[PDB]
Design a protein around this ligand. Structure first.
Ligand SMILES: NC(=O)c1ccc[n+]([C@@H]2O[C@H](COP(=O)([O-])OP(=O)([O-])OC[C@H]3O[C@@H](n4cnc5c(N)[nH+]cnc54)[C@H](O)[C@@H]3O)[C@@H](O)[C@H]2O)c1
Ligand SMILES: NC(=O)c1ccc[n+]([C@@H]2O[C@H](COP(=O)([O-])OP(=O)([O-])OC[C@H]3O[C@@H](n4cnc5c(N)[nH+]cnc54)[C@H](O)[C@@H]3O)[C@@H](O)[C@H]2O)c1
Ligand SMILES: [Zn+2]
Ligand SMILES: [Zn+2]
Ligand SMILES: [Zn+2]
Ligand SMILES: [Zn+2]
Lengths: 374, 374
């Protein structure tokens, strides 16, 4: 048995920014009250994990990153009621405490217990469950899925269908749900509309999936890497454009293509310039633009507020606007009922031991999602 | 009769920025096809008219400003079907052509025929109906209501109730409708919500009216002129705050007062800094901020897009989001049925000849709306 004991297991530790992960033994403490220890089965490589490496996203180091994953409960602490040992689970990097004003709001999902705004890199109790070479190691977004075992707070885990293929549904833990919900829940894309999606990685492809599910008539994919266009069209893009191919700014091109601006635009990259371009290319009186990309730490954009005064709506969202614990099980059930596809997002499946190779595939432009299998 | 003839009348001509208006004779051409010549009865002094003087809102000079008004049709050009001589009318500085993609959209109102985005200071046909000292004079927003007579395109006028008191309902031509619609239509303020209104002039007071009509539980007025607070409370503010009284930035004060951020905020001033402050003070996950104030020409704001990524919605609107020709007659009918009050906005009445004194009253901080009578 491992229950009640420290587990020594393999994890990918990030000791400092801009260095490879170190795949080595860590100690994982047993769960305390209202905590859950999970044996990980699969984890995806999201660009946001790379943001930790690159210093785009600031969180305390050293750290066990990883937030898009699925696994099986190994043990539960005192007082846990929502999962049991043996359950398939998805960690929730946006928690759902159920008690804060955001969790009680019909349209809020960015629970005040999150560790994204002001990252501490701990459990809810302000401590860590991880040790490596005798040193405490930080958590990441309450999840830390680049480990054979993690410990999460109960509000940071959802039970999912026991028959779930974990090597696919791990994507519901971040990239699929974020993109799909950004289209269907946050933007509320309408039937017959014209959409523009900036960035055709895993999250942007999921935005396209959502725009197509919502009945958009036109879905224009925008990326500087034309190698991304074929898969974008497979999942619903009607046109793709590469800004590098044009003498004019792409907002002008997209305004012309849409006969005066798009209904819905999405920034799914993480650049200040494309956030302003994406806003500008939606129709000035009734267009909606959604920021999905994580911006570089502490940098401000510049924009003319007449873009808003005319009638545009600008919003952003975490995790596609989904209340995480309510939504993740339902999304898995919908995947099991063939309501959407995840295979188009998966370009590579590697053992966990190849985490660094998986990140190199992302950084080279060659992958959408690599799934790492423990 | 005057039909088909040039009318010589008095108007308030602005020859130069930062100078008093010149009340002097102009020649007003008769209406061409699909044009309407109006004998003006009352016009309000909106801060946006002062923006023309200050160069905050750039439009070609020399100009006849004025856009918040009511009058009586003197004559109609060929093909006009929607008004007749003798009808009471409100000029529409946001037109409603009924034919463009915005007019056809369920939620758009910033008709593509507007003269606000890129002002030319003409009629729709690119020409002027005004001569002064033998020189052509620009129109303003297609309305030019600071004149005993104006000529407007048919898409820039609405017929209103024959029994309307024009010295009151002129406010439906800009400040009332803008503020009230910004709350009820654009923000869609909810029952029991907390609202923050930045700027307690005629437009901000009308925002408060709308927030109260929508059932807000708390309406916090924000102004650096504490003399504005008493009337704000009369029309529905529950608290007023002066940023100058506080050591901390007012976004932090309002976040504390609202136990984590307001539901709805409104910028009703026209400053870049208060547009960002108003966004920041709405709750980070589900708050909504609406820009109403006109920004200084060609200037960009700076902001951190993490304010949006967490879940905030930022939008702006023209004319309270109302489709102008559909909405103005209904707002007049509702006024006549006592569904809202206009008298709280009217602090001063002057004859048209005292227009410069009316602008002095606005600039000193003393007035809300001065109504000028022809
Ligand atoms: N809001 C959230 O909850 C949330 C969740 C998940 C991911 N994210 C962020 O979303 C973004 C996309 O993540 P991902 O899909 O995993 O990343 P990704 O797979 O790296 O995809 C990004 C895409 O953007 C393309 N690109 C880069 N620069 C430009 C440019 N100038 N113009 C057009 N295209 C360009 C690039 O070629 C690539 O295909 C990242 O910033 C993530 O951090 C946010
Ligand atoms: N979007 C539209 O369709 C539309 C329509 C009408 C008016 N406007 C604009 O709305 C704004 C308000 O117009 P109005 O009510 O006639 O003007 P106003 O009567 O000048 O009211 C503005 C108020 O802002 C207050 N104020 C100034 N600076 C600050 C500050 N730093 N912090 C807090 N309060 C401050 C000021 O004391 C005054 O009471 C102006 O910019 C207009 O141009 C826009
Ligand atoms: Zn919560
Ligand atoms: Zn992610
Ligand atoms: Zn129109
Ligand atoms: Zn106005």
């Amino acid at each position: 048995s491992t229950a009640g004991k420290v587990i020594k297991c393999k994890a990918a530790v990030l000791w400092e920014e801009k260095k490879p992960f170190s795949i080595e033994e860590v100690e994982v403490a047993p769960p305390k009250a209202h905590e859950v220890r999970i044996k990980m089965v699969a984890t995806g490589i999201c660009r946001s994990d790379d943001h930790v490496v690159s210093g785009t996203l600031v969180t305390p180091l050293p750290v066990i990153a990883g937030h898009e994953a699925a696994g099986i409960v190994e043990s539960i602490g005192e007082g846990v009621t929502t999962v049991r040992p043996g359950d398939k689970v998805i960690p929730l990097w946006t928690p759902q405490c159920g008690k804060c004003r955001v969790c009680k709001h019909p349209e809020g999902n960015f629970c005040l217990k999150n560790d994204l705004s002001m990252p501490r890199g701990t459990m809810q109790d302000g401590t860590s469950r991880f040790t490596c070479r005798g040193k405490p190691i930080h958590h990441f977004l309450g999840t830390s899925t680049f480990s054979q075992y993690t410990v999460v707070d109960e509000i940071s885990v959802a039970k999912i269908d026991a028959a779930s293929p974990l090597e696919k549904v791990c994507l519901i833990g971040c990239g699929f749900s974020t993109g799909y919900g950004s289209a269907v829940k946050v933007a509320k894309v309408t039937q017959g509309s014209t959409c523009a999606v900036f960035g055709l990685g895993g999250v942007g492809l999921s935005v396209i999936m959502g725009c197509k599910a919502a009945g958009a008539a036109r879905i224009i994919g925008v990326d500087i890497n034309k190698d991304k266009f074929a898969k974008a069209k497979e999942v619903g893009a009607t046109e793709c454009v590469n800004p590098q191919d044009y003498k004019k700014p792409i907002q002008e091109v997209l305004t012309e293509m849409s006969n005066g601006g798009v209904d819905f635009s999405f920034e799914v990259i993480g650049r200040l310039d494309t956030m302003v371009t994406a806003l500008s290319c939606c129709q000035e009186a009734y267009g909606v633009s959604v920021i999905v990309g994580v911006p570089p730490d502490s940098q401000n954009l510049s924009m003319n507020p007449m873009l808003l005064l005319s009638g545009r709506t600008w919003k952003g969202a975490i995790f596609g606007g989904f209340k995480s614990k309510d939504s993740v099980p339902k999304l898995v059930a919908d995947f099991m009922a063939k309501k959407f596809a995840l295979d188009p997002l998966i370009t590579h499946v590697l053992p966990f031991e190849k985490i660094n190779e998986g990140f190199d595939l992302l950084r080279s432009g060659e992958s959408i999602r690599t799934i790492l299998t423990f």
